[PDB]
Amino acid sequence: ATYAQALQSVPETQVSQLDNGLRVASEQSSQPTCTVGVWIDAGSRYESEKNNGAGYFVEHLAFKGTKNRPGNALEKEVESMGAHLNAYSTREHTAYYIKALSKDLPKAVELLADIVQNCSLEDSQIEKERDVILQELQENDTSMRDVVFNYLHATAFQGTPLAQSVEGPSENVRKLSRADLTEYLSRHYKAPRMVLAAAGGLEHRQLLDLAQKHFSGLSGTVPTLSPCRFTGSQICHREDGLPLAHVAIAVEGPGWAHPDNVALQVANAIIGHYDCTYGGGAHLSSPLASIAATNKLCQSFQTFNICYADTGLLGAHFVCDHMSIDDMMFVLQGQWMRLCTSATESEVLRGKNLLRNALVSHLDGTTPVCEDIGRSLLTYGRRIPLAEWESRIAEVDARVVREVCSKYFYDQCPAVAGFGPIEQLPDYNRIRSGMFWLRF
Amino acid sequence: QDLEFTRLPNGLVIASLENYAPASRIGLFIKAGSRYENSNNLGTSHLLRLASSLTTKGASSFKITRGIEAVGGKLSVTSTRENMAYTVECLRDDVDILMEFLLNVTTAPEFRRWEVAALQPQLRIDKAVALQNPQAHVIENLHAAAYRNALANSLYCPDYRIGKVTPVELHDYVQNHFTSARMALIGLGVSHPVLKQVAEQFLNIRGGLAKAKYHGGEIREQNGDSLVHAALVAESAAIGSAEANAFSVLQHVLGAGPHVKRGSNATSSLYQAVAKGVHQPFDVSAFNASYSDSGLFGFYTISQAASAGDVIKAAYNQVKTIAQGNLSNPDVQAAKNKLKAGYLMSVESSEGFLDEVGSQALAAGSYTPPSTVLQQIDAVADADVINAAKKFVSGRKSMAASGNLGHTPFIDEL
């Protein structure tokens, strides 16, 4: 009984669709618990300068009373069921979702449907959520990871909606009107751009029925996404008073749909992630990590491949001592260079295995799986079987990693963001000369 | 698709479950938590947690790290006050390789002088990072205030010992506490015959082996955080007593934390109790810790520094209400549904299930299916809950706080 074989046995994801266009997707198991939610192709990317932050403002109001369950009635019913109600906003996606007992699924689905559609948005509650967001913005300003990444986007996609923060500028939070939240919801929360997803002990049939019963009033009658122009650029907030420097660096990536994301994630896994609690240290597999541990070049770093429609951020973020920024950047670029030109078979096998494990072990329990269903239908227009993922990973070899990495990294212009005591952060020109090798 | 469980003659429990999933996950659980340190080897189990990739008899420090990473692996070590747990995850085809590693690290570490010496500063790093979360301050002090002996020990080495844990001490700790008698070998995604086999040969460690005495105390930490954390607990009940289930339900009556993002917590006694008067940033939750031979029950506040008097009192009062009768069945139903739901959810994953099955294997000696657990939760009487609340109010108090404690009361100020 092998891994290969196990992949075949993984439960089927099922998808159906209402006349208003809303999709319904589910994975079935023999659990007593489930997770169910609405995923929506809406977010900051669909916002203009004028309405930026609306998606976020709505998320504060999402659970504060419907017309059917006014005031705190919404949360009362959820608490007493023992069920768990959560939400999130990306640049491209919005989700609301409930974790509950399989037995309460019908009631859960009712609650979701009530939240998205009959959300009451009371003038006085809006005034409350106004100051809350303002203060959340204050707190955010003291998260350097948050700030640098926001900046990465701000410069990487300058002059577009991709440049915009999810939370919105403080101006907008102060001014955003009840009417404006109305416009936004009316414009974006439309059935062909929404998915009802769920996993656990449930019958696909039954979910679909419940969908039909609660959601069918939802309009499906077009905000589509302009390409977003990427720009080689640098944003540097020098603030010597902070105790560590954050740097995020990224090249233009391919976007959700492209098959290169597989080979790219293999490569990213080779290079890896590191944190000064990581036990591995000098003996670590990644040269970046062993060298960064050995020489105390940084506290931490991660590779990332951030995916959007038809674009993305492919790179790395590190946090490090005020004096290691250059050394860090040098080793990191050296890694990208090595993979582009000279990646070994063995290390690619390793990268494969990392990504294999990552995909299997991530999809564990009802919530991660419910999300995978939901987002997948928004991004790939379907759920991708584990066994398919595996055969695309198996395809990747030395040559493929080299070839793909070259496409995106080798002699391309990165976008750069640093915050903090970044006095030593390499000049942009030096960074750009680090994206090729004279020897190759 | 059923949990298989066996106990060897020599006491070692084995639990497995062939779920034929693509990923396999093995835990070796050990009665070897911080409680088993004495005043002479404080911090040793901390170092031992940090030390899992030091050279073993069977594989070099290099081989552990490279070998596990080769196949997309994960090797990981968890401690509570009572247990330690060595977990390996991988793709199912390679459990052979990871079992080899797990057995090496737990069965024959060498703890070479130079490696141990070298790992010492990690103690400070891991500790320093941990103490960033101020909950850890309060909770570790709390245990120290509450007990005089084992459960008193913090999970993170005390400063005076960083640099000073020895090879010999690491050896003693392993030789004395990693014995067949005090281990549970849990296995999701592997065949139970093969776990038996492995454990029979490789976990045959000859059995090389005080009640925790709650006294009650108070520990204050002055800084200037301007938010004050405080926990107030009384002795509770040990795991496996039906009293234990009573406390758990009382916890969920009073409210143990939020069910809704940005939630008002309409249903949390404690939260609404505080909030009827104090209208600014705060948080409050029932605290419940149940151990082999004791338990702590109470609440934890996070308040403004100036408000801590007002918040801690408001919170304590709410428990007095329950203790003096005021508890509807609506409330206790809500509580049980929460606990029931939250239990089942906590075993939704591979992670959570493994931890539960291994946890129980040590603590009882058996598996309790979720259905039976829910029965035991249903089986608690509102009278039992009122009793548990009664027990807290009347019981001798332990307290720990940290922050600007200017307006934070001492125990004896109620």
């Binding site: 609690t277 | 990981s76 151990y291 609440f299």
Partner: peptide, 27 residues
């Protein structure tokens, strides 16, 4: 932390569990 919203969920009710790893950050 500058708001009830963000502050809530901090009040502890888990007796602590320290977990450190090989290739996953400590918690």
């Amino acid at each position: 932390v500058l708001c009830r919203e963000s502050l809530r969920g901090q009040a502890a009710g888990r007796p602590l569990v320290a977990s450190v790893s090989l290739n996953v950050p400590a918690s």
